[PDB]
From a paper:
DNMDP and related compounds, or velcrins, induce complex formation between the phosphodiesterase [name] and the [name] protein, leading to a cytotoxic response in cancer cells that express elevated levels of both proteins. [name] is a well-characterized cyclic nucleotide phosphodiesterase (PDE) that hydrolyzes cAMP, cGMP, and cUMP8,9. Here, we show that [name] and [name] form a heterotetramer stabilized by binding of DNMDP. Moreover, we demonstrate that [name] is an [name], that [name] binding increases [name] [name] activity, and that [name] [name] activity is required for DNMDP response.
The dynamic motion of the two bodies necessitated refinement of each protein dimer separately utilizing the multi-body refinement approach in RELION25, with the final resolution for the maps for [name] and PDE3ACAT being 2.76 and 2.97 Å, respectively. Residues 669–1100 for each monomer of PDE3ACAT could be modeled except for the loop regions between 779–799 and 1029–1068, which likely adopted multiple conformations. These loop regions are equivalent to the ones that were replaced by short linkers in the crystal structure. There was also clear density for two DNMDP molecules, one in the catalytic site of each [name] monomer. The structure of PDE3ACAT is essentially the same as PDE3CAT-Xtl (RMSD for backbone atoms of 0.38 Å), with only an additional two turns of the C-terminal helices for each monomer modeled. There was no density evident for the loop regions between residues 779–799 and 1029–1068, suggesting that they adopt multiple conformations and are not involved in contacting [name]. Almost all of the amino acids in this sequence interact directly with residues around the entrance of the catalytic site of [name] through hydrophobic interactions. This includes a close packing interaction between one of the ethyls of the diethylamino group of DNMDP and I557 of [name], which provides a direct explanation for the increase in stability of the [name]-[name] complex in the presence of DNMDP.
Residue numbers in the entry:
A (entry chain D), B (entry chain A): 551 to 560
C (entry chain C), D (entry chain B): 669 to 778, 800 to 1028, 1069 to 1100
Write the structure that this text describes.
Amino acid sequence: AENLYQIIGI
Amino acid sequence: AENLYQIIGI
Amino acid sequence: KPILAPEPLVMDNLDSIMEQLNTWNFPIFDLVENIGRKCGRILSQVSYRLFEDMGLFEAFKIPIREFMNYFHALEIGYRDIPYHNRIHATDVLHAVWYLTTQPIPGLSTVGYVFSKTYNVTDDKYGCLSGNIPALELMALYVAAAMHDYDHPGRTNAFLVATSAPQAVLYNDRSVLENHHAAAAWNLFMSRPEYNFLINLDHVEFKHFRFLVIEAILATDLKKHFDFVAKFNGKVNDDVGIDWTNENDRLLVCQMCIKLADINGPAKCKELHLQWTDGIVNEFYEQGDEEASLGLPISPFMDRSAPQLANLQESFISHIVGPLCNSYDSAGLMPGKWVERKIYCQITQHLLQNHKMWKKVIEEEQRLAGIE
Amino acid sequence: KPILAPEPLVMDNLDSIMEQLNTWNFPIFDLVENIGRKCGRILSQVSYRLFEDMGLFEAFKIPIREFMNYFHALEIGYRDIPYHNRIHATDVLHAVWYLTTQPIPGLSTVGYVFSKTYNVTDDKYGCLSGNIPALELMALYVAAAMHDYDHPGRTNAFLVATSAPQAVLYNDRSVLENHHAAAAWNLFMSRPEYNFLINLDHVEFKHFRFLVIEAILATDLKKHFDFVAKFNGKVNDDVGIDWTNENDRLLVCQMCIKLADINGPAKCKELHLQWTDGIVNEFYEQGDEEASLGLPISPFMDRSAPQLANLQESFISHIVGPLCNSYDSAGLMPGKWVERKIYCQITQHLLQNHKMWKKVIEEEQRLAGIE
Ligand SMILES: [C][C]N([C][C])C1=[C][C]=C(C2=N[N]C(=O)[C][C]2[C])[C]=C1N([O])=O
Ligand SMILES: [C][C]N([C][C])C1=[C][C]=C(C2=N[N]C(=O)[C][C]2[C])[C]=C1N([O])=O
Ligand SMILES: [Mg+2]
Ligand SMILES: [Mg+2]
Ligand SMILES: [Mn+2]
Ligand SMILES: [Mn+2]
């Protein structure tokens, strides 16, 4: 889930 | 050092 | 210009629908339609109902007028953005109330405050209200009411990347959560008419403020995995959760507010779809702003090429899934005995929604492969 | 109204005294007298001298005009309070430069930047500049210049207790350090004429900002023991300090800035006494404000009953002592080989000052007992 973590900022 | 920690906030 | 609450503090026309405050799938949008979008009194009325159910008004001698005035001002503070509006705040407050008050199978119980919808006679169920002091519960409820105050409709990453004034003010460290807590407390301390905690002593007020700030800051998703790891480490310990420890109770309250902030996927199909529509609308607005500013469009925020199913599946499998699993493994998940096994509506709804999103993703992939 | 630097960027009359920038006991107050208290150009001139000695002007193609303008604005930002003024900022910048650049016995060395006062031919000495990249060193120097920007002359506890607007803004979490970093970066980003980092790419600028913010926030004394414990745990590990790890280098820079922020007791007798006089004057002003506000007077802040010797002894034995011991045990403490043993001026000065304060305390106790 690279995109989800990028959105969150992790 | 209760007073010193109180000043620092610890 | 103090934002005073309307003269009728209690609305009788809602007394019927508030009767459904004891169920997880609360028709909040029907309540919004009944009350009216112009007035925006949903959060104040729901908070008043929950406080009456708990009895915190008599426990802490809370003045009704100041409480209603401050919560109406809090409602006014919330912006009319698709997702992070007063409806979300009301939903999170209802969810924290449900998690704290509803019976929990096997939870042993040790002033303290119990809800009027709880059966104390039965010994096979417990509630978090019986292990968490009333002051901490009130702090958790207030923080849930304040969790997303004055939300600008943008994520932390967008604010950091664009060098927004809020990001510079908080040094790119939990910009949204710090802003929410700071604005809420500044509003609380700005007017004497909003001081509904006048009956608390100096030490109790400081402890309440600390608990509210910690709970608000726990809602940040950037530190989600840190909280999950800490909670898992505490639970897997042979000592387990100690309800006589202030730190353990604070961690439990933070986990409750974190779970309630993302409770949308854990609801029924209609509520989950409506919340998903709201959040993707907010994402699309953010992506349009990013395109206007010239920055590359963030994933899932492209209106031209939606990925709603992928976003929901990833969010459920990565964020909501592990959090719900940890909360259930700790033993704090509400449920019922089936005759002995434990049945949880929240977990079943989450599994059903995840299966629905997986089916949608598979269908979309098959359709794309055919073409 | 941009605060532009004076047209002469370099002052020739100081060129002599800057020659003593290579020694720990730098006569900074003599430099203040020479430059003049009205202009307040000490920090800009010292920073320019240090940057020329390192060569960061040519390494990063730093424009001289923007650098001088921003550092003059930073000098103007510092208030004329007894201790946390531009003199303290200059002292901390000089101390971080001394710690990073001066030879360290036994420190192995691995772009990188070396000072013009360092002998690279010798293989028995090392410097932190040979193990820390130039960007990180520049970030550390800038953070030291920004560590106490816009200090109000009051401690964190006073701001939290009095519910100051700064405390409410940052939710009682490192109020002073967050305020300093936020104000410094807002000043940097407010005017194009202060942008001396225009030649850095987007990623490098973000990394530089992150390093500066982390170093500034490390200066908080409320988290002093946390940093000390973390550093001791990292050093006592069999792996030890790894200079190829970004986190280890960040921790080393944070420890350097923390040690430099409280370097006063580690200096000679005259400088230590002057800094002690300044800090106790600031404490007395804070105590007078507390008495005016009706709050109980904090310890060591009562002008009527001074406890300067007790305060200094406690500060040296509890704060400066363990920090210096950890820094020396890590092996980063500057010194010289004596012929093989290591001689450190900083540790000897700290021990002498501690003995002086113990003697003063014993004499005062004996005098009180006689009466
Ligand atoms: C602002 C927090 N966040 C954006 C990063 C976010 C909010 C809401 C939802 C969300 N998604 N699905 C729903 O059903 C409603 C809520 C829980 C997801 C995210 N997220 O992390 O992507
Ligand atoms: C503001 C930080 N602090 C007040 C809590 C403080 C500043 C400076 C000194 C100080 N004392 N002695 C000196 O020689 C000069 C400086 C290092 C001590 C303290 N402190 O923690 O009490
Ligand atoms: Mg939030
Ligand atoms: Mg400081
Ligand atoms: Mn939220
Ligand atoms: Mn300082």
